[PDB]
Structure formats: C-alpha cells, structure tokens
Subunit: 335 residues, 4 copies
C-alpha cells in the first residue's frame, strides 16, 4: 500500500524527507551563467524547508530584474486574457486585481493570495521548492493544499518556462482555484491519489496534465482555455485555440494514458464543457481506480477520513446528517 | 436585523470597532495594587489589537510569578481530573499533555494549542482582550473560532477568577473543544446566534452558560463535569457534584431563561447524558429560534452561507450531494 | 440466521406454510357451545386460505349479531374516543368516518380501509386468521403490511376480547396506521425484526406489545392513549389512564425484556412523548440489535434490501442521491 | 396552472371525465369492415370505464384471431430480439417469459404482467381505452402508473400498428419498465408533466416520443434499440439500426422541439449511452422546465408531494434522513 498523509500537519514531515534537503541544480536545462540568480534560486528554496503547516508564508524580497519580468508577463498576459482565455478566469482575475494585489509593479507575496483562496474556496497555497514527486503534489491537493513555488523564471526566458514558477501558478493555477466547483474538482483529482499505485499516480498526473494544467474549457458556447500552463505563457495561449494542435473531447480513459511532452507546445488537448462536467467525469474515473478503500476529505478539521470499513463510512454519514438536519431546519426557517 | 459576520476575514474588522480600542480597567472588582501586572494586562491586551485573521498568534513572554500560578493551577487541577471530571476530557488532557505541551513549568503558548485544534476538530483559538460582547463571542463560535484571552488571573487569586483567563480556557474550554461531537455542538450554539436578537443572544448566552461554560455530563453511568468554568477553578469542580447545588436535567427552554450569577458557586446545573444528546437538544432549540433565515457553516472556505432563500439551500444541497457522491463511490471501493 | 421475506409475493408461501392450513380451535379459552360461530371463524379463516398478494380482499358477509356487536363496540368506543384517547386518533377517526365508511350499522370491509391506508401512508391490511407466528407478523410489518384478522369477537364478550378481531384492529391499529410517522415507526419495528433470532423476535414483539399494541401518548402536555388494544376494549381505555396501573417512561431496553400478561388489564405502561420520539428510540434500539446485516425497505417495488455489503449500501444510497437531486432541483424550481 | 393528480385514487376521477365515456371510432384510418372486431374493441374499451384504482384488472377473454396474430407477433419479434434489440430487454424478456407468462399460444392477461412490475420496480399497468390526453398519460406515469391498452391490433395489419395495442406495450413498454433505472427514468419524464403547460406537455411528449417510445440505446459498445415502438413492430426494428434514418445524439432541448410523425418509419433517432445517462439528462432538462413548484414522488403512499414551499421540501427532507439513518445504522450493522 502506497503512503498518503492524514493531517495537514502530517503533510509536511513525510513530504520533506523525500522532497527537501536536496541540493537542486538551477534548471534541467544544464548550466546557466546565473549564479547570483542561483543564490536567488537557493534562498527561495530554503524558505520552504523550515516551513511547517500553520506557520504563515514568509514574504519574499524581490529585486527589480525579476519584478520587471513579472511586469513583462503581467502586461502581456493580462492583455492576453481578452484573447482566448476563460471567462470564469476573467472575473476571478478581476477579483485578484482588487483583493490579492495583482499589478504590474508589485508582485504579490504568497501569503495574501493564500488568504484570498481561504476566503473564496478554502484552498491554501503551500511553498515548495520542487515538483520532485508527482504523488506528494497530488496527495497535498486532496487536502485543499496547492503546492506552489516561490521562484520566478529567468529574465532570459520570460515567455516560455520549462518549470512552474510564480508566473505559472499565480496567473494560471490560483485564478482557477478561486472557482468553487473547480476547486472541488481539482481536489477530487488529488482525492483519487491517496494510496494509489505508481501507475495510478502517473495516470492521475496524466489526467492532471490535461484537465487542470493544460485544459481547454467551453464558456458561452465558444471554446476558451482554462489550463494553468495555457494561461501562464505567451504563445501557448495563442496555440491552444489555434488549429495546428488537435483538441479531443475530455474523456477519463483518453486522459489516463495520453502521451505528453513538456517542452514544445502540446498537440493533444481536452475540451471540457464546464468545471462541473469535469467534476462529474472525475466522479466516473475515481470510481474505477482500484483501491482497497476510498477517502473523504473531512473539511472541518481539514483532514482525510479513510473509508476502509463500513463503520468509517457511517461516521462520515452522520457528518452529512448533522449538516443535512441543518438544511432540514433551514427550510423550516425560510418560507 | 442584527449584524453577523460572513467570513473569518470579516470576523476582525466588524468586531474590533465594538470590542477593541477600549481602554479597560484592571479587573471588574475595582482597584488593584498591581500596576506591573496592569502593564502586563495592557501588553497582553494590545497583542490582539493589530492581530488580523490568517496571521499566527505572536508568542507571549511570561514572568515567573504567573508561571508559578500557572504551575499552581496545573498541579492542583490535573490532580483534580481524576476527581469529578469528564473522562472525555481526561483522554483529551492526555492528548494535551503530549501534543500541545501542557506541563507544570511552561504554559503552552496560544499558537501551539490552536494548531492542535486544527488537527482534531478544526476549531481555532483567537486572541481577544475582553469579553465585551456576548454576541460576537457567540457569533465567532459558528465560524469554528473560539474567542480566547491570553492573560492570567492574578497571583492573589490563584483559585477563583472573576474573568476568564488562560487558566480558565486552556484547561476548561479547549479540552472539551478537541472532541468532535462537542465542537459541532458548541458551534451550533454559535450558529443560532448569527443575526439573532439581543434577547436571543441573551437566551443563547444563558444557554451557553449552562451547557458549555458550566455543564455537567454523565459518562459510564456516573455524573461528571464537562463545563469550561467547572474545570477551571479549585473548589467549584468539587462543588458541582456536591449536593448543596441542584443539578437539573438539560432542557432547551429551561436553559434559555434560567437565572445565573457569576461570583458565587452556581446553584442550578444541567446534567447532559452525552454531547450528542446536547447536540440533538440544541437541534430542537435552534429550530424554534425565530430568524428570517438560518445559516450553514461552509467548512471548506471556513465561512457562513446564509440560507435566506430556497436557492441558497440548493447551493448547500449541491455540496451535500458532492459530499454524498464521495460516499457512494467509497462504498463501491470498500467491500 | 433465521428466515425473513424479501418480496411481497414471498409474504405468502413461507408464512402460509407455517401459519395456514392449520386446523384451529374456536378460542384459546377451552370450549364454546357456538358451532355456528365456529363455522363463521372457519369460513373467515378460509377467506385468507387462497389469498395471495396482489389480489384484493374478498368481501365478508355479516349476519345480524356480529353487525350488532360491531354497533355496540362502535357506539361505546367512538363515544369513549373523547375520553382519554389520542387526538391524532380522533382526527384520524374522523378521516376514517368520512373516507373508509366507519358507521354504527355497517361494518367496513377490509378492501376500503386498505385502499385508505394505501392513500395515506402506504400500509396495507392483509387478511390472516391466526397470529400463529410472532416473527412472521412483525416480518410482514417490515413490508408496510399489517397482518389482520377478518373475524369478530363473541357477542357474549363484546367488551373484552381474548383474541384480536376486527373490533380490535379496525378501531385501535388502523387509525394509528393512517398516521405518517407512526406508520414509519411501526414499520421500523418489523425492519428490526427481519432475520432476527428467536429471543430477538420475542424482545421485539415484547416492545411492540408496549409501544404499538398497548402504548400511551402525551399530547399538549396531557397524557392520552394511542395503543391498539387500549383503543380496542371498553374498560382498558379507562384503566390505562387510571392510577392503579403504573406508567413508566418509554425506554428501548426496558420495553425489550419487560414481562407482560394478556388476560388481566396490563400493569406496566410506557408513556411516549410523540411517535417521532418513539421512532428515535426504536432507531437507538434497532442500532444495538445484533444482526449480520441490516435491511432497508425499498418502497418503490415495496420490497426489502439486505445491506450485507458496502455494495448493497451503495446501490441503496444511489436511490437516495436520485431522490436528493430531486430535492436539489425542486429547490431551484421553488424560490 | 394546469391540473395534475395527487393520489392514485385521484388519478382516476379527473382523467375519466376527459378521457372516458367517449364513443370512439374503430381506427383513425376511416372505416373498417370489422364490426365484430369493433364490439371486441368496445368491450375492451368498457373494461377501463368501471375500473378504479386498487380494483384489480379483470381478465380479458380472447378468441382465435387475436391469439393468432399474437402467435404471429411473438414468433417474429422474439426472433427479432437477438437482432438489433437491447440486451437489457433480452434479460427482461427472459424474465418475462418465466414469470409473467409470455408464450406463443397464450397472450398474457394484464394482471400477471402488472404484478411483475410491482415486483421489480413498483410500476403498475393501468388499463385504458384511448391515449386521448397526452398530459394525463404523462401525468399518470409520474405515479409509476402506466396507461395501457388491453386491445390488440387487427389481423389485417398485424405488423404495423397505427395505435398502441397489447403487442405494442407488453413487448415494448413493460420489458423496458422492468429495469430499475429506466423506471426511475420514465417516471421523471412524467414527473415533469405535473401542472406543466400545454407546450411543455407537447415538449415532454416529443421528448417521450424519442427516448422511451422510439429510443435507441448503446449497450456494450454496439448500438441497440430500447424504444417501446421500435420493439413492437416488424420492419421498424430493422429500420432503426439501418442507415436510411439518421440517429442523433440524445439531447435535452433537441428532443424537446424535435418534429415527428407517426405513420412513416421515423427519420431522427436519439442514441442514449445508458438508462442512467438518460436519467441524468432528464435531470438537466426537467430542471429548466418553468413551473411554480416541483413535485416529489412519495413512494410509500404511492402519491405526489407538491413542493410549492420550502416547508414542503422540508417534510420531504425528513423523509430522506429517516431512510439515511436507516443507512447510517446499516453501516454500523455491516462491518
Ligand atoms: Fe502549476
Ligand atoms: Fe470561557
Ligand atoms: Fe393487534
Ligand atoms: Fe406506447
């Protein structure tokens, strides 16, 4: 049986011995002349090392050379939201320009966007250095905890980034995460990954690559993009509605074993009619995932309840009935 | 219509113009020769002033004269947990001696005990100076937020305290709050106080006085105490099972308009068979609480969904069916 | 594990193999000089001989003396329904008098009152001569099917009957069965009795003796009677609220093993605050009833679902999800 | 507001002043030389006139020539069930050949097949002469009551029938109605027609024409037919899988206003992936149907609860938790 966390406190200690105190190279593209950026890459990874859950995100000081490229990705891509982007993202980004502080000059710290996501849907961002485990990033996302990075792509590559940075996720991930039914859907991707096998971790990350990271929506009839990495780079948002890639309909099995690269612009895409339809289709795929149990996210204590017994489903079922009797008493109150 | 909070971010700004920047006197008993304790009372009042939600509780430095009285209330009342105290409190206090850091010499800081309650039930302790509003302390309690006071009673009164301190709540309130059934019960007391009138606030606070603050339980046949203030003082825990006060059965309306004082050891007590019997009896009382709506705690975003329409109950009921479809897909998985 | 029916057609064969084609004597009191009444009992018994489920009840002919003692029990007991009887039974009796055909001169046949119960709550009266198995009558009452006797007590004993007749059941059982929550209550006793062992069958029939057959209610503060046999005989309805019997509170375990006779007017009675509270106490008793499975009454096909696996509870919960999506769409429709 | 029934007893009273005591002609094709068949059509039309609910179906005598065309349709169409027909029908027709009494020589009476539908899903066949109101046949279907015709098409036209006969519905309708999901699905079509406007009756009947009467399924990958009239006539069952008609995908609104004829083999068909997917897609279409309320089928009393208030939704919701606490105590029983 593969391992999965139980509390958000247990999310740290068993996912830092595998993901942290690791001396990482600069980028997988080997060798940069960016040593003062590498020390900026080294200090930015050391914030997530001593960070434990419940402690706040320590704020990041920024020099102007990554602020100006944060400005360069801002003024390009915010103008690129009227082009080909999801309309749910447009109202979410308008909320992020008022609440979080999405601007050209000031890059928002990870705390104030985390305080935004707890007030909208209850997600929180979690600072982490690497994407080094595909399981642990998915196992955290079940806890309504999005693993996020605190670094920026380099000024030499301001448009295409081979690794997810704050320009990737604060503009691509978390404006989708401010949606309610997407955040329940993106969690149920991670809710299927607890104790899931390594090919199921791969299949869910194959699924996660094509309906959250790089996924195309359909709002008001017209097809728009809602993927995180689609709304993170310059030409790919122009590429997804362009027709030299092909857009399949979103299927569970076709997104389970889909081949994918990470460097050039992706060929296969998955059109999703709505975030709820992605949630209904993840309900079909998470059922057939073979597992000796299943898990329910217990959102009061923000934990995971293993349903490895009929008795465990019962103490979840009264957790439904204590708030369904709330609905039974609310329908008496209103009227 | 009275005012009630909507988010935990809105819990601070509309409950500090009414409860904070108030220059408080030392104690309601007028006149102490405790000026170096009054500046200690003043600095412990100002830590909650600029405290905003989402920020952690800053740690408190302690001089030895309140350490020794924290040591005095510890070695007496932990010895008084075999006598007349709840067994559900007893295993909880055993968890509080291991996880939170309860001992003789060091008083546990508020961050470590609040991070404990995130792991158990999802309550959090929130630092506040005064008990200045009886509505807002109940209005925060629906948000799974317990208003708590970071000061200590004076060394001249080590046993009886006229005001709730850390010796009141960190030994009386929180080890009840770590129970799952009592936390849902104590929140439903606060869930009736949202938008409720001032005599309904007073009816609920008289109810809160007799089934959370001073409430007596019944485990293993014998009657024990589970009240917060009962498990907070020297002689009162020996007084509640004594027969010179009378213990009534816990009733919805006979706890609503029950008279109460605060100085003398209390006469009337309310025996509760279990916390679930306290929960279903609050379900009967909060139903008849007259209100233009009812409110439901949204445990994902830690907020309140006001159900003032049939449409508002639906967007809760979609959250119930997405919760139940997790359960139906779990019962397919287990078996 | 003993035997219990699954379909309503399987209420017939395995409960007529043990309770039918039995040569029955006239009364358990030894010896009547009433051979024409014996032929009446024999013909009434062979009405239920070839009766299968889905067939209507064949109408019963009545001569002058059973019509006259029906008039006697009707004009005594309807006049006594103002005396110490349930007001819910009073309004249900008014509904029976305008709907089913309750009058002094004509005794109502079983078909019209059965069509009334399928109109109100969905019970059906089902003709059978003897109560020969205490297990099978309860296991029928699981199916919302009340086994019922199509004969009349003796004319020389118009007030006290040693056996349940139409003057017993049509006066005491069926106007309680037309109530919603008491029907769901009395169905849950048989739902507890499905596949239960012999001393569990004895305990559940013993409970049924004290909360359906002879059970006492409390409406508007005042104690009244709602039991079947209490509201079936003349002197017992005035005896039960007299003080020479003792009335304990309704308890799940103290009604399970409570001793009882049947000839003398009963000593111990069980006051119930409401039929809903009786339903909660039967829920708490039926929880602790030891059984390798449970059963859910599926009221669409009127059948019984064994929950002996999490898969069975899943395909039970899917119908709950259809009927709750019905409510979630209804709350969108209304507003 | 249009009129809708409330009980199954009230289903007869206000759907016989509008559909019964009307002298109907032989066929809509004007003029047959079939006077002794017209009296056979008349006596079948008069068996439904004095029919009431709860009163069972009286048996129908059959002479040779309606048996001889029942001989003809049973040899041809049962051979046409391995070809192009739904496999869920095939196991149901095998269930219908065993239980109901389906054979070549004896046309089964309506009582033995209606006793089967109460045994599987809880539907019942209700004898009626004409389909004269498209609302009332839909308004009955919400009650799990299928309006059905106890006559047979003439021997001169034994393969194509201009009107639904016993060969239409006992081979087409009821072996679909024995499915658990389809009976819930076909009721939800009728559940949208309560108090619905005449264009909504027409929109539902055009919907009912294309997903129950003439609807094509997709079982095990291959496309098969599950429509009632498709599995009722000779050449149409080979026509629907043929390619000179076109089979659209089943849609909510494209089935609502879809034009249709009745004489020529139908052009447009609606492929449905499963009966549950048709139930999900009727959940989407009947949601957007404008109505002053919605209706819930209360399957205990076999009646309809009109949900024109939040209070009416609440007395449904206590029915949910009453059988959810059944499920909550079942998950404790099993384990
Ligand atoms: Fe990302
Ligand atoms: Fe307190
Ligand atoms: Fe009886
Ligand atoms: Fe038809």
């Amino acid at each position: 049986v593969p391992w999965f966390p139980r509390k958000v406190s247990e999310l740290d200690k068993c996912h830092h011995l595998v993901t942290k105190f690791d001396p990482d190279l600069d980028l997988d593209h080997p060798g940069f002349s960016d040593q003062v950026y590498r020390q900026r890459r080294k200090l930015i990874a050391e914030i997530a090392f001593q960070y434990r859950h419940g402690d706040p995100i320590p704020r990041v000081e920024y020099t102007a050379e990554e602020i100006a490229t944060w400005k360069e990705v801002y003024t390009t891509l915010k103008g690129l939201y009227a082009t080909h982007a999801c309309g749910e993202h447009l109202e979410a980004f308008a909320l992020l320009e008022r609440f979080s502080g999405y601007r050209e000059d000031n890059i928002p710290q990870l705390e104030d966007v985390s305080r935004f996501l707890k007030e909208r849907t209850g997600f929180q961002l979690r600072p982490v250095a690497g994407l080094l485990s595909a399981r642990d990033f998915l196992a955290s996302l079940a806890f309504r905890v999005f693993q996020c990075t605190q670094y920026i792509r380099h000024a030499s590559s301001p448009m295409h980034s081979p690794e997810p940075d704050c320009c990737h996720e604060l503009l691509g991930h978390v404006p989708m995460l401010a949606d309610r039914t997407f955040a329940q859907f993106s969690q149920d991707i991670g809710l299927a990954s607890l104790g899931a096998s390594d090919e199921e971790i791969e299949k869910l990350s194959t699924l996660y690559w094509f309906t959250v990271e790089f996924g195309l929506c359909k709002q008001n009839g017209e097809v728009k993009a809602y993927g995180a990495g689609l709304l993170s780079s310059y030409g790919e948002l122009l590429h997804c509605l362009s027709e030299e890639p092909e857009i399949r309909a979103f299927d569970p099995e076709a997104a389970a074993v889909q081949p994918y690269q990470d460097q050039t612009y992706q060929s296969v895409y998955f059109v999703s009619e709505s975030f709820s339809d992605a949630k209904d289709k993840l309900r079909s795929y998470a059922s057939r995932i073979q597992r000796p149990f299943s898990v329910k996210f217990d959102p009061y204590t923000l934990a995971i309840d293993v349903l490895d017994s009929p008795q465990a489903v019962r103490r979840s079922l009264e957790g439904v009935q204590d708030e369904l009797d709330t609905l039974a008493h609310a329908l008496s109150a209103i009227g």
